Design a protein around this ligand. Structure first.
Ligand code: CAP
Ligand code: CAP
Ligand code: CAP
Ligand code: CA
Ligand code: CA
Ligand code: CA
Lengths: 467, 123, 467, 316, 151, 123
């Protein structure tokens, strides 16, 4: 009960290393991959991260005695050595519920990842996982709609959904965008979308594009008899600008918009999430920029943390990687964070990179979206990895078809239904995949032409991100 | 190169950047007012000699613009000795006040003349 | 003039590698540090980055022939091998003015840094620098005020400004916050601030803190006779919430607020920047999270790109590092981006990490803020590195003083003025620093007590981020 | 009545370098001008919001300066803050902040801004108690030549309808064109309730205003202390006389420049009021005042030779 | 670097006639058809137009020394005689980017065409053409739609 | 443990936490200003020595920041004895004022120097 104030510096580990602490169920837990500089013991490194992401600075401060430092301090409670690594440790840090602002992903990241990554005393730091306690989860809205409500709004059951980014990424005009959207949607795709970087520009202004894309999607809906969507992008330079685009989409009565949550940011994304709940709009989330942060094993933040953060802030879809296409993603790690995105409960499982048991107290689940370098011959593997609750998107795979967009869409829709029928009849998609596709080419000329064009194309490289 | 002073350099609108009016110069300002057929009036003030902002602050609102009327405007005056006489009567009764002379044009309802005619001790 | 559509995949370098291209003065130029996978030639790696950050996807699309691909395509126009590195190159990429949304840092990052960092064909990618053309610079507001106007508002000239973060980072109450702010400001500091993660929480709600910090700052201003500020934090979960805090600061008539621009995000920060211009508020920017992205030399984005982006979006202050204190920053690299933040023109200078000549066409300059692990014995070096146009902040260096906050503040103010006098008199700060400090301790008891406490403390470690 | 100013022309002054000064240097210059006896200072017509000086900073510093000059001197001061802008929304934002500062007067460029925008601002200024100074930038594109265009008297009548409390009228004797009789004609068309056909002054039609308020004519552009007698004779009490160069070009700085102009004008007003003839005794009136006013004496030496005398393009 | 303030009037062409200036790509350029009064040389006429559409007035002001006049001043950089005309010239004037308010045609015309057409020293003035730099173009929206989108 | 005093501890921005400038130290600040080629100017104030808020209260508005200019900025000055001489002239005319020396950089349009050079009685 009050010890004298003693000015001067002392080791962090005297206050912030706490190997006997039992974690509270209201605590936020962090798993950090820490690489200390030569001569810094792991206890002091772990302590330093805990102190500086919570309550401490570099010298002793008299004002600690006005409060109760031991109820607020973050604390390194466990240290585990990394197998096969010189001087690299998993440090576990616990943060009391009271440190965080309710409903704010921004504040949660600001503390846990704010300044500690630039410490001179560390060579490298990566945040691998977070345990988000159910008392903090309940302070957030989460997805505007979630998987159950999305399928009920769209009347779509029993198969993965199909989408497609319009190509030339940039440079098409508003009316050519709509022309391409109509021909894609009428061949059997459920969705088309704006490229992540199509916002508003000299070659195509946003309000013109929204209006022509509404005419095109309604024309394909009436021809086919199935509900159609086109993800209109609301990403913009300011909140006012972002809000104006969500407002006009509402006015057009269309089902879904999109946002680039990391390049727009969490403050803006939470705003739009709340608007889409209030107005019945589906929200597709694109993760542009994530790999700047999440690619390397030694340093950054793993995608699973960024995906949990999106689930809290809010979105109905999030890109999850494809495993087999042009961008990186290992099968087991991917299955791990797909479960963290879709399910109510996920047990600790270090073989899939899950460091903490995580519960969601009925937060709606997000639909994983697989996109980037995939084509008809990938269909069997994609259906096996993600199952029914995903969206599979083919941009190049639809707009690169020899006969145009409608035929490109037919091919993808026929391939997917062929996989679904075969799976449902008991066939093994991993082993009979090519035979399933090959059978469907005998009655579908459109799939046959797609099969010929891409039969040799594969993306196989050594992964940078392994368990 | 001379520096324009800062302290006790309060001014009083028209004519106050000139040397002090002599008795002849004051007489000629009253002749000018009467020759244009404007109505002379005297006004005086003891408490707030200069303008200020106590009760409000919006565009064009100032306190201290109204002073108090000495008797009434001298409607029909044609004789400068009357005006000068009332100035002496105002001075005798309020030796501690600022006193100005104004002249009204009733067709325009605009004061066409206004100048300080007497100042109290230390001003 | 129109060649037939040929479906199928072909190499990126056929369209996107363009070594004879002369750059336009309206182009955005990117310098990328690329590390290809084994077997991927640098030309194809460079082409792949340009294609996929601009117009191209993985297979050939017929819709290219509706536009003019050659006027919109991004293009790799120069490749330079990195000395001392196996399989690492600087690839230079040019992006036409028309690809970008006016006034949107969000859109500029989305294109250049959006998807290319996760390509299977690369092992690592780092964006080192950007040449922002003056025609794009003019579409942004820039800082609300900038250096000249800030000194004129505050009546502060001829010395670096002095600041101070309140400690216990988290856990102080609203009234103890203001008590600490009064005692710091009254001893000679110009500024105090919210810690980056103090937003609104169970231990201290924001509106209570703003109110008590206003009473305290006004009391210190009246006692001392010098204008005072306290950076009130507006960072929050939503734009609505952020706006509400900037609105209450405006109502209190205080001079300066703060935002965490990376954790809040660029869409939100541009909104706040426009509000601060419209309302005469100074805007202090904290860079929490930057080191997740910018620490490592092989992968991510260098701080200079993140600093240029802040100058466009807008801020009057930005944290710049200290060089000598607890967080990493090399002297020459730091001098480079301090010049990019303050000046109208900066010539290419590879020895300070400046890849491109950059002009600002009179965009106001940002004040660099040096903070984190610094104390009175650092004052001479700090003054030498940054000069008059900086803010030097001492959190632990004020609230860790043995006699309390007021005496803490006196010691820092006396040390700084001692350095400024000596500098102005012709003395060499690098060589005579300790003697200048020592001389001031003979007539300042406050500085003498500070000097005794921290005389041995230094932060010297190997840097991870070198030229 | 709002300004408590009676019995003389009002005195103003454009801040110089036209462009390029900062927000704080603008305010510094304003304080020194206003403290020496000018009633008004103003934004140059083209100072709006720019890279060298943004509008909201300028408004704020010019408020501190004008209030300091008012308290020192005891006389009401104003500085014309410019609301001219690219859009109506932007224009309105500036008039709103001037209102918030509690200052007496704003300005607008009515031809470059345009009549649609100008009428909007005129209604806002009536609704909120702001004086409205009007600058006629661009008029000489239209009104210079006798064969083609529109004469200024038509543009001046249009401004009286749309609305403004001040409009620039020309000086006759300074650097820009304006013939004496034509000018006297449209000055009466701007100030008076009724003006009879008079072809010798270019008035083609008898014109009545049914009590539309009168506009104060503003004389500005290339004038100095030696012009004071003629200006006072031409315009009389109901005018504003503005000296930009003629204040900020004074050898001793802005305060002394302002004193010189204020002393010159009071000397003319006293002499007129005592019966002296300003057309014939003008130079003697100025010369007498130089014996007791060092400030005016310095101004007189600097500009004694300076005259603007050229053939006119716009004659009856 | 700072010369003494010298009160009084001097010719415009001392500061604003600048025949060796190379135009910047951020400059606004004006082509003016100038007809001077008898006895006014074309250099002084062109200088007068440049000065009074940018930074200068009729006598010397001390406040020039608080700024950098040479970076803000408008400048007459070329003079071409008109064929078949007595006393008529095309004068080319350059104005720095920083003189103009972004997105405001109103401000651009106010500077370039505001006061100089009524100078006593000129008989007539016509602005024939303007070079609008791409950095200033980008501050404007332009047409709401434009030809392609309208069709 | 020393307590930082409260009463009559008004400060004056740059250099005011140091001991009072000797004549040599004052000379060296003037040399520094001239060696950087900044324009020196003197400013003085008798009435409101410190900053206050009378006319407005919004963010960034303060009264008391403008002082009054002594003559004009000394454009082209290269001799410190001129600056010190003007300071002596200012002091003699205004012995009751606060007087400061500033130096302007015209390229940046920023004062790079500002310090208090004379203080009246009891300060
Ligand atoms: O730009 C692109 O590459 C895409 O449009 C795919 O185009 P194609 O369908 O033509 O490949 C998608 O955004 C990426 O899949 C994003 O990556 P991720 O899902 O990994 O975040
Ligand atoms: O949390 C902290 O550590 C600080 O308050 C400083 O504390 P002390 O003054 O007590 O050290 C600053 O935010 C860091 O300087 C931020 O880093 P940067 O400037 O590098 O972004
Ligand atoms: O730019 C200028 O020239 C002025 O500031 C005057 O400067 P000086 O006071 O320094 O001459 C005025 O706007 C003109 O008088 C406008 O002309 P007009 O009144 O004829 O419309
Ligand atoms: Ca895309
Ligand atoms: Ca902090
Ligand atoms: Ca003007």
């Amino acid at each position: 009960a009050s010890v004298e104030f003693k000015a001067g510096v002392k080791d962090y580990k005297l206050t912030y290393y706490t190997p006997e602490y039992e974690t509270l169920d209201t605590d936020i837990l962090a798993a950090f991959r820490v690489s200390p500089q030569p001569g810094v013991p792991p206890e002091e490194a772990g302590a330093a991260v805990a102190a500086e992401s919570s309550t401490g600075t570099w010298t002793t401060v008299w004002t600690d005695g006005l409060t109760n430092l031991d109820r607020y301090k973050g604390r390194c409670y466990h240290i585990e050595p990394v197998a096969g690594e010189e001087n690299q440790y998993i440090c576990y840090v616990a943060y009391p519920l009271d440190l965080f602002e309710e409903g704010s992903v921004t504040n949660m990241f600001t503390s846990i990842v704010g300044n500690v990554f630039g410490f001179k005393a560390l060579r490298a730091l990566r945040l691998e996982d977070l345990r988000i306690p159910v008392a903090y989860v309940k302070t957030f809205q989460g997805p505007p709609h979630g998987i159950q409500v999305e399928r009920d709004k769209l009347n779509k059951y029993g198969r993965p959904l199909l989408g497609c980014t319009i190509k030339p990424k940039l440079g098409l005009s508003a009316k050519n965008y709509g022309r391409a959207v109509y021909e894609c949607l009428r061949g059997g795709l459920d969705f088309t979308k704006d490229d992540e970087n199509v916002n508003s520009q000299p070659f195509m202004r946003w309000r013109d594009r929204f209006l022509f894309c509404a005419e095109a999607l309604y024309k394909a809906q009436a021809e086919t008899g199935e509900i159609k969507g086109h993800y209109l992008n609301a990403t913009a330079g300011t909140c006012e600008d972002m809000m104006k685009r969500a407002v006009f989409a509402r006015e057009l009565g269309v089902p879904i918009v999109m946002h680039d949550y990391l390049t727009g940011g969490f403050t803006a994304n939470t705003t739009l999430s709340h608007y889409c709940r209030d107005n019945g709009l589906l929200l597709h989330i694109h993760r542009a920029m994530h790999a700047v942060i999440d690619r390397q094993k030694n340093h950054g933040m793993h995608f699973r943390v960024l995906a949990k953060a999106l689930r809290l802030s809010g979105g109905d879809h999030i890109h999850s990687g494809t495993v087999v296409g042009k961008l990186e993603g290992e099968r087991d790690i991917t299955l791990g964070f797909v479960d963290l995105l879709r399910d109510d409960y996920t047990e600790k499982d270090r073989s899939r990179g899950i460091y903490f048991t995580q519960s969601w107290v009925s937060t709606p689940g997000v639909l994983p979206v697989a996109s980037g370098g995939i084509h008809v011959w990938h269909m069997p593997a994609l259906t096996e990895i993600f199952g029914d609750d995903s969206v599979l998107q083919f941009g190049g795979g639809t707009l690169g078809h020899p006969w145009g967009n409608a035929p490109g869409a037919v091919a993808n829709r026929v391939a997917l239904e062929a996989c679904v029928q075969a799976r449902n009849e008991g066939r093994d998609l991993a082993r009979e995949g090519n035979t399933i596709i090959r059978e469907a080419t005998k009655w579908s000329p459109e799939l046959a032409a797609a099969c010929e064009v891409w039969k040799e194309i594969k993306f196989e490289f050594p992964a940078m991100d392994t368990v | 190169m001379q520096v324009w002073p800062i302290l006790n350099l309060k001014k009083y609108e028209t004519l106050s950047y000139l040397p002090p009016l002599t008795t002849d110069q004051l007489a000629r300002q009253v002749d000018y007012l009467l020759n244009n057929k404007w109505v002379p009036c005297l006004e005086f003030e003891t408490d707030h000699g200069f303008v200020y902002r106590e009760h409000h602050n919006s565009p064009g609102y100032y306190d201290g613009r109204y002073w108090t009327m000495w008797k009434l405007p001298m409607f029909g005056c044609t004789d400068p000795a009357q005006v000068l006489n009332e100035l002496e009567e105002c001075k005798k009764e309020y030796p501690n006040a600022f006193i100005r002379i104004i002249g009204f044009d009733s067709n325009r309802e605009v004061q066409c003349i206004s100048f300080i005619a007497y100042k109290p001790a230390g001003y």
